[PDB]
Design a protein around this nucleic acid. Sequence first.
RNA 1: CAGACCUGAGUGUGGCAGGACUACCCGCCGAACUUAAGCAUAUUACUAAGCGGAGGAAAAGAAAACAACCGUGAUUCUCUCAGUCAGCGGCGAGCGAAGAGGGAUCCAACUCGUUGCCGAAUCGGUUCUUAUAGGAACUUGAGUUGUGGCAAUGGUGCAGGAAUGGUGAAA
RNA 2: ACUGCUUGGGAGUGCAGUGUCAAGCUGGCAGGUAUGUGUCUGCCAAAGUUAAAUACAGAGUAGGAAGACCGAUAGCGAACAAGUA
RNA 3: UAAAACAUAGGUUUGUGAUGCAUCCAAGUGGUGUAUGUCGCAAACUGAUUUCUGCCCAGUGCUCUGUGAAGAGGUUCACCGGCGC
RNA 4: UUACCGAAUCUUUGAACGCAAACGGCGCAUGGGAGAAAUCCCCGUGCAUGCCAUAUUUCUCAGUGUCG
Lengths: 172, 203, 144, 49, 56, 60
Amino acid sequence: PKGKNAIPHVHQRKHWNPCSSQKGNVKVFLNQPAQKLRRRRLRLLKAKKTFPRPLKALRPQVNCPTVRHNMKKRLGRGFTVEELKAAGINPRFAPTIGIRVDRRRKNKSEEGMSINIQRLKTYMSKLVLFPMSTPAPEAPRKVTEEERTKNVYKFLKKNHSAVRFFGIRRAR
Amino acid sequence: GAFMYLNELWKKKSSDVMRFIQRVRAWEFRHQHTVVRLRRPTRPEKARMLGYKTKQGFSVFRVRVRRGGRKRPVHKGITYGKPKTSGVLGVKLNKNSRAIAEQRLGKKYGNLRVLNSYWVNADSTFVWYEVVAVDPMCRTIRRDPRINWIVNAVHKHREQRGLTSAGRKHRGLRHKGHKASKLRPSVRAAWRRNNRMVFLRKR
Amino acid sequence: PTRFKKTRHQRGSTFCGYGRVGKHRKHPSGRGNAGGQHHHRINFDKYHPGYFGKCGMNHYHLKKNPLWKPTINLNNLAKLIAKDEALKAKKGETLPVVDLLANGYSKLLGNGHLQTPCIVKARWVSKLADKKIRKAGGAVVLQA
Amino acid sequence: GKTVLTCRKGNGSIYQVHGHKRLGPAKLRILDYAERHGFMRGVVKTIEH
Amino acid sequence: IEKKTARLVMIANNVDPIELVLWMPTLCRANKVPYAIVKDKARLGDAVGRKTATCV
Amino acid sequence: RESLRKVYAGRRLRLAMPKALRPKLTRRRRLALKDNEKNRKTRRQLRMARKFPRRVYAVK
RNA sequence: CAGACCUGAGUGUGGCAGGACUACCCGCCGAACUUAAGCAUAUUACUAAGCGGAGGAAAAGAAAACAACCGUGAUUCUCUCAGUCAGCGGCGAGCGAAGAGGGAUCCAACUCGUUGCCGAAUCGGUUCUUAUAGGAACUUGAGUUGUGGCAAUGGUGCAGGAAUGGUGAAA
RNA sequence: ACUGCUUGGGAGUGCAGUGUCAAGCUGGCAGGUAUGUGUCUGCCAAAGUUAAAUACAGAGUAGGAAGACCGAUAGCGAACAAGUA
RNA sequence: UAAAACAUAGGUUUGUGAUGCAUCCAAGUGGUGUAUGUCGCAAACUGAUUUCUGCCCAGUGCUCUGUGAAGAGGUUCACCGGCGC
RNA sequence: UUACCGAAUCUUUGAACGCAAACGGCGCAUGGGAGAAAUCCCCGUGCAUGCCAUAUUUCUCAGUGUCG
Ligand SMILES: [Mg+2]
Ligand SMILES: [Mg+2]
Ligand SMILES: [Mg+2]
Ligand SMILES: [Mg+2]
Ligand SMILES: [Mg+2]
Ligand SMILES: [Mg+2]
Ligand SMILES: [Mg+2]
Ligand SMILES: [Mg+2]
Ligand SMILES: [Mg+2]
Ligand SMILES: [Mg+2]
Ligand SMILES: [Mg+2]
Ligand SMILES: [Mg+2]
Ligand SMILES: [Mg+2]
Ligand SMILES: [Mg+2]
Ligand SMILES: [Mg+2]
Ligand SMILES: [Mg+2]
Ligand SMILES: [Mg+2]
Ligand SMILES: [Mg+2]
Ligand SMILES: [Mg+2]
Ligand SMILES: [Mg+2]
Ligand SMILES: [Mg+2]
């Protein structure tokens, strides 16, 4: 630390390094490419092994959690019992025909619900069962209307302040 | 619902009747070996929760354990190096007493495979946990779908590896989520995972 | 490249630029930031003035996802509007509509001189953005 | 410091009683019923060092 | 006992953990089922052809 | 050995066989659960696997 | 009192345990050097050594999880979150994660106890069927001090394949 | 509660010891600042199994593929009857 | 460095009646003096004998003589719990 | 002869386990062998501890435990 240099915080004061003395804590990726093939061989080794069957089972369209991501629409982890019911599928039958199930999910909103019942209902059309014997909103463009009058900020800020000082306006 | 009666009768350990029964036992158990096999559990309803079944190849053992904290076995009680690492009497074993009783038993009798243990009694000096060892090579065990996992070699000494419910307790695994992230595959696994110096191949 | 190190230049010059006197040692001062409050005091105080101390309220278990409010200025809404779509945008006519969550922005700060109207569609707005955006004949429409 | 000799005698190593040639404990007869309800005559046989 | 279909019950006197049956007399007293304690689980045993019976 | 495998042939005596003649594998292959007892499944599972067999399928 | 049970022995019988390996992995144990320009908390490090245990991986795992969302949904791993306007800290040296997100993996889930309805339907052994069948008869032997069920395969036969090997080119 | 270790975990992250010791007729646990209280949200602990993706940081078995590596004072201690003399 | 030191006998002093004294041990119905028992044991000082060990107890050392209250609770205040002399 | 692998062979030991052990020692029981005027001698197998199961034609028992 002589000079303008930023204060360094290089956390390497543990014996991560491998020397005569230590078996180090190191994770190199030298086998990264080999693994990429291994998986690649193995997924291909698997799809060949189960030819008719889709490489990956049907999954729900779920909402992402926080405000940072609730706009995002990731693939989920198996359908709700209520979704499988509404699609008319049997929930313990569903996995056997390649539909993932998830007992834990709740359909908190009719939106994600109905996006999925359509999804299973769409999947069951495409499905061919050998006998034993992501949608989202978009907008175009429009003339501004009543929007030109109202300031959305004092609208935004009332509604924010309404919550923000809601506890402090009770005591008053 | 006989279990429901026998389970809440034992929830009143402090009741003077249950306090009397327990009294006579702890007396009775003091005059017995540190390990004692039972033809039956003292707590049939509790042993059965933990997977005991009155079947061939299930056997129960009452393993005694001295209570109180560990005294760290340094010579003459002296400790070397830093003052923090001093302290003989007050540092405690970082291991459960159901664990230590499951481990005493499973080490004495490698013939068997402990399934669980439960608290049985505890006088001033001792605690008694009755372990439910399974015998891996009893045919009844080998052939029962509910239990024959224990036969698989992966569980040879589950208890010594802290896999039993007691050994998961002190191992912190009674907590999912943010209360056991530093702990979670294992404290060791958590350590590798955080202390590794990953070198991405192209960085 | 080892070729280029001045290790390789001063092969032959006995002290590798460390000096005949005042020899190149090890840790002539301490490891790392040692003596930040002592013999390197003049150094942190000159360069890293705020380095020592505590300044504010703690926020135990900070969750930055809830806090995520990235901003785009009025002056930068051409980045989102298609240049082709944006071609004719009279304030009294039809306007390009610009969802900002789609484009990864949350608040709308009202910086420079917007002059081409747009119906910006965003979670938050500045006092000056919704005003400017209206005066241009556009309109923010609140979303979440 | 280093272990005091008073403390080392407690190891009782070199510091144990000899007693190879000791005759055994020199005690009274076991408190028999005969002691408690009569007497036992024993003749002294030999006085040893 | 609980269904009170029982019209007499015979708790055994001795039991390995009396806890198994310790509650039972209070439970018959509550359902107002007649009950009796009797000397040995071995006798309820042979009476039922089992080598021991905690109850009958 | 060909005439003691003959003396102890048949299930009834195969447990009584001298263990020099008993099929040595590894200590583990012998102590491991056999498929005969390995593939055992509880009667409920047995039924809930018949009721929902891994029916084959494709997706056009 | 004959036995009966309970408790406990002694043999016979059939088994297992102990050792090795221990890179990785699981449990406990547990330093100091070092760093802090001294040094005790700290750091090294929840490391080394020490003890005990597994397996081909292990451990983990099916929510007493996160979030606070338009909500997600076992575990492990990974990239990132993040050397962090988190946090710990002689708030010093230093230490330092988690949710989310992309992904790998994933036709991944189940079982008891309990509850309720039954109540030996169970198990072990014997014999038996070309079979120590998930079959059958038989057994007081264990088991109602609660096995088990319900709801919340074995025997024999053929083939192909794959895989290993064996063979096999030009000039 | 106390103690002790532990943790980024901060009026407690996990744990252990000891004391104490619930609830399930406004249940219980989590909701990262203690307390009492009221809402709401997720969960349902103290029993069990469980592949794959992961480790092999001084292992083995049987093979294989390599190298901008070393080139006999180098590379493993060991290119050799080397953990040998 | 064979002494003048250590030992030594002799002297004194201290602890101590086994629930003991000294004392080992990580730990125990563990260990040593102790297979002992005050003519013993453990601890110290002095250093044969003869002779004598005066004065000082100031210092130092040794010895001896949970329950209430407030609070919504966390909590807080209060009362009881080996020293000094 | 080479290569491989199924059948075996695998001495003394070693966890080492019948008891020991600077002893190539010594047992008890079981069967064999040679042999010999049986005693000796060689050999095979069993014989450690702990624990679980079992006594399947249900072994023998012990307790001023409980009763009858
Ligand atoms: Mg020069
Ligand atoms: Mg220079
Ligand atoms: Mg120089
Ligand atoms: Mg210099
Ligand atoms: Mg100088
Ligand atoms: Mg800060
Ligand atoms: Mg071992
Ligand atoms: Mg230092
Ligand atoms: Mg180690
Ligand atoms: Mg596992
Ligand atoms: Mg597991
Ligand atoms: Mg998850
Ligand atoms: Mg650390
Ligand atoms: Mg049951
Ligand atoms: Mg620490
Ligand atoms: Mg529960
Ligand atoms: Mg060389
Ligand atoms: Mg002298
Ligand atoms: Mg004198
Ligand atoms: Mg004097
Ligand atoms: Mg031997």
